Design an enzyme around this catalytic site. Sequence first.
Site, short mmCIF file in Angstrom:
data_model
loop_
_atom_site.label_atom_id
_atom_site.label_comp_id
_atom_site.label_asym_id
_atom_site.label_seq_id
_atom_site.Cartn_x
_atom_site.Cartn_y
_atom_site.Cartn_z
N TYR A 160 77.78 -99.32 -65.25
CA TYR A 160 78.08 -98.96 -63.85
C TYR A 160 79.70 -99.02 -63.39
O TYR A 160 80.94 -99.79 -62.61
CB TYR A 160 77.76 -100.07 -63.00
CG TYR A 160 75.83 -99.24 -62.37
CD1 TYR A 160 75.89 -98.10 -61.63
CD2 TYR A 160 74.91 -100.58 -62.48
CE1 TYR A 160 74.88 -97.97 -61.82
CE2 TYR A 160 73.69 -100.09 -62.53
CZ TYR A 160 73.73 -98.21 -61.99
OH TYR A 160 72.45 -98.05 -61.23
N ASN A 212 66.72 -95.49 -55.28
CA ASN A 212 66.08 -93.53 -55.62
C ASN A 212 66.18 -93.46 -57.12
O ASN A 212 66.41 -92.31 -56.85
CB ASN A 212 68.05 -93.00 -54.99
CG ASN A 212 69.03 -93.62 -55.64
OD1 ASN A 212 69.30 -94.43 -57.28
ND2 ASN A 212 70.53 -93.04 -55.59
N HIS A 228 69.02 -92.37 -62.02
CA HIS A 228 69.90 -91.92 -63.13
C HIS A 228 70.34 -91.37 -63.28
O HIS A 228 69.39 -90.85 -64.55
CB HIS A 228 71.14 -92.63 -63.12
CG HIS A 228 72.31 -92.72 -63.91
ND1 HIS A 228 73.47 -92.60 -63.03
CD2 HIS A 228 72.62 -92.28 -65.42
CE1 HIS A 228 75.02 -92.65 -64.26
NE2 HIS A 228 74.42 -92.12 -65.30
N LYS A 262 65.11 -96.21 -62.75
CA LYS A 262 65.43 -97.65 -62.55
C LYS A 262 64.16 -98.06 -62.16
O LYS A 262 62.93 -97.57 -62.52
CB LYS A 262 66.26 -97.05 -61.86
CG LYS A 262 67.51 -96.77 -62.56
CD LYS A 262 68.48 -96.65 -60.70
CE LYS A 262 68.29 -95.30 -59.67
NZ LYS A 262 68.98 -96.34 -58.67
N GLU A 318 77.97 -92.11 -71.32
CA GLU A 318 76.66 -93.10 -71.22
C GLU A 318 75.53 -93.26 -72.23
O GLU A 318 74.86 -94.15 -72.52
CB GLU A 318 75.57 -92.63 -69.67
CG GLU A 318 76.87 -92.92 -68.67
CD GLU A 318 76.03 -92.34 -67.72
OE1 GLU A 318 75.24 -91.53 -67.42
OE2 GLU A 318 77.45 -92.67 -66.44
#
Lengths: 156, 151, 151, 151, 151, 151
Positions: free
Chosen positions: A56, A119, A122, A16, A133
């Site tokens: 998402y 974080n 993903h 990310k 995905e």
Amino acid sequence: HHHHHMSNERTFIALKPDAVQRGLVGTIIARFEQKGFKLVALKLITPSADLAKKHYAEHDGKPFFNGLVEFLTSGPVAAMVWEGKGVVAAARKMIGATKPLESAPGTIRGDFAIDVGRNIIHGSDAVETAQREIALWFQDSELNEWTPTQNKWIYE
Amino acid sequence: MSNERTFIALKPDAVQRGLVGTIIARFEQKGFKLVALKLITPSADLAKKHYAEHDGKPFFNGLVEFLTSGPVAAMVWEGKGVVAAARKMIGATKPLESAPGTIRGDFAIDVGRNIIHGSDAVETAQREIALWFQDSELNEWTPTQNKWIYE
Amino acid sequence: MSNERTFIALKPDAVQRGLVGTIIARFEQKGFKLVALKLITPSADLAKKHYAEHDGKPFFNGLVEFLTSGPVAAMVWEGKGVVAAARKMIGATKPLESAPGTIRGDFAIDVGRNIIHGSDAVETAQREIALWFQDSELNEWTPTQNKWIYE
Amino acid sequence: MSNERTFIALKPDAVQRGLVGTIIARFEQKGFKLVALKLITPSADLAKKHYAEHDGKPFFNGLVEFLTSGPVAAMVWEGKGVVAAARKMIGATKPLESAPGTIRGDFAIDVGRNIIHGSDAVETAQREIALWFQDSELNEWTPTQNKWIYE
Amino acid sequence: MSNERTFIALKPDAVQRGLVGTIIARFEQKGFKLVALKLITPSADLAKKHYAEHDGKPFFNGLVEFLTSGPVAAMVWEGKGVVAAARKMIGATKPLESAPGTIRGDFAIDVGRNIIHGSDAVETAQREIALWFQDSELNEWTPTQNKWIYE
Amino acid sequence: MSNERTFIALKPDAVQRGLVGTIIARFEQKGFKLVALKLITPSADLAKKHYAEHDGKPFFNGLVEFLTSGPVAAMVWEGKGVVAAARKMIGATKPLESAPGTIRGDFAIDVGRNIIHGSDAVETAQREIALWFQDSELNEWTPTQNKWIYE
Ligand SMILES: [Mg+2]
Ligand SMILES: [Mg+2]
Ligand SMILES: [Mg+2]
């Protein structure tokens, strides 16, 4: 139903915008290479709002959805596909817990991160979401068909 | 909450084994902020105060004697959850009970040669920081990277 | 002489970029002995004294302003040939002209963001050590590894 | 000058040998900015265009056959002096004559299995970037760390 | 108890994948003492005796055939708790369920290509060391660093 | 010739300082093939034969006494240009003059504690391999990665 090897399982991984800004792209890719997983696709992209919202989709309508989408679209992301036996669950184990502070040393979030909203990475949560995905982030022409010589030593 | 601080000491075994930079790098890579750092050879008074909770226990003298025996890298780290996270990064008290990936799990064997001290709670961290560092030794700064560490 | 000493400063770019432990580890793995270490935010006067040879030159103010703009990891390393060896480990003044394997060659691009200072000679090392450290901040110790580092 | 760009390809030997992340990390740690990156299996037509300056030479077919024989990590790096710096990081044409610390020096033996290509000049980088990447693939972004990289 | 020993073999997959030095370094960095080491291509007799507990089970022939297929780095490590600690360092039988930070967790996927063998108990370690190594291959030495490994 | 071989010894300082795995990994990552490896404490007669060209010189006995003073990791590496490449990887005779990135440049200070020996020429490699290894200790194998190492 199933092919004689489940070693063709694939998962989707995104580094990310925090991972890219913190210089963690090569370090994290190397952890997947040293494990024996096969890189099938890779690109640096700045996701569109549509891509982020669809990525998402399970959270659409929830209070934190807009923040997730705004962060993912805010800068470049290293999107990739890894192949190997058990890769979906193994990548989740390599990533660590949702909360980096509760993630074990040796995991990516345990070694490198502090905040849930920063974080780093993903990974798909299941085979079915991985399939979804991968197809969302990559066209078929972006998936590389190749055979690692080292698989003689990776796979029985 | 992200201004929480903890005290870390790399004990004389860590210094003699060349582990100072390696261990500091683990805290940097996690996103914690280095507030203070020095190499000092603790006096008996400082070591006794450091271990004061164990006054009168049979193992107290051994802890004090070892900590005073050579240079120690003393430091303060700042960040959300840093006290508990540093303990997780360090591992179990006994290195053989510590997991691979932790400092003690990767680098140590003997509980009396277990490399590192980290504060065990917010209150003991505050005491230990003040014991080891004057306020003038604490550096006030803002890491540019906190945009990417903290939401 | 095996007791030669040099002064090393990891400047605010090194601290902000998370390179403190990585760089210290290169000196530890080489066999040099850490004598003193502290994280300090230099005053303008300390920076001007450090860069005294450059006062009057067109880049002086920028050097001083940069050095005072964040914390600095200041330290003293000891060993045979440590002054010249540290300069070799650092690289050229220009990171882009520094070889891979050196600190500036591996990690930096611009002269004004070149991560580290090391003394340029024995006499300037003696001056810089005394400027940055009081004698009571220097640690007297004998690494047991020296049996295998020194003949 | 800090917006200079170069093209880097990690060739099929680098991918098969598991060197993609390790090599990317060397560019990130240096301070260069990743503008574009993808894993692609070069088509014959792309490989022939990439190697066009060698068309008709005895070694041309072998270059094309090897580059098309597996996936390639193709990428664009930005920063001051990045073209010449990447060449220095890669090492010499012959891996056996490449210094330890360079990519070829550390990882390769044979000229025909030389791991990596980097553009040799600004003008060839411009040609190679335009050949391998559409403009839409180039990411426009600003690293917050640049204040510590560039003066 | 600090002279406990265990037997470790880096199996043919570890050697073919270039993991010999990387894995040895993990045992060195932990404080374990290397007593014996050799690269050998095990004979059928040695492999059958090594896996004798599994003789007559359906997977026995495959274990033997794999172990004899190429070179193996066989070695003996000494230290307090080394048998159980090496098993923790190795991870679970299934690399996919081995924790990050373990050898199998970091480097492997398949049970039949799980890189490394370590003795499962003190008694089996004694049997395996004696099976693989004559007494004259065991090195008797005292690490200077044991002052810092052991209290 | 891709089957050229050199002899490498990690001397007692390398073993005592925990550098065995780190150095082996450098040869593996370069693409060289490990043919033989063992940990041995050399006899006085073996050390004298190893150093026979210096017999009658005052420093011969010091070299012999050092080489026998702890375990040695002796090994044979194979590949194109391996004799000269290993010497480049090792560095200069004087560690202080060895470049960062080399083994002696990264890890050593003193000529008498110079970590490693590598054969200086193909002919001396042939002599040294035969001195240190019996033919039955050499492993015959084919790395599958060679199609990516060699053209
Ligand atoms: Mg003035
Ligand atoms: Mg003036
Ligand atoms: Mg051979």
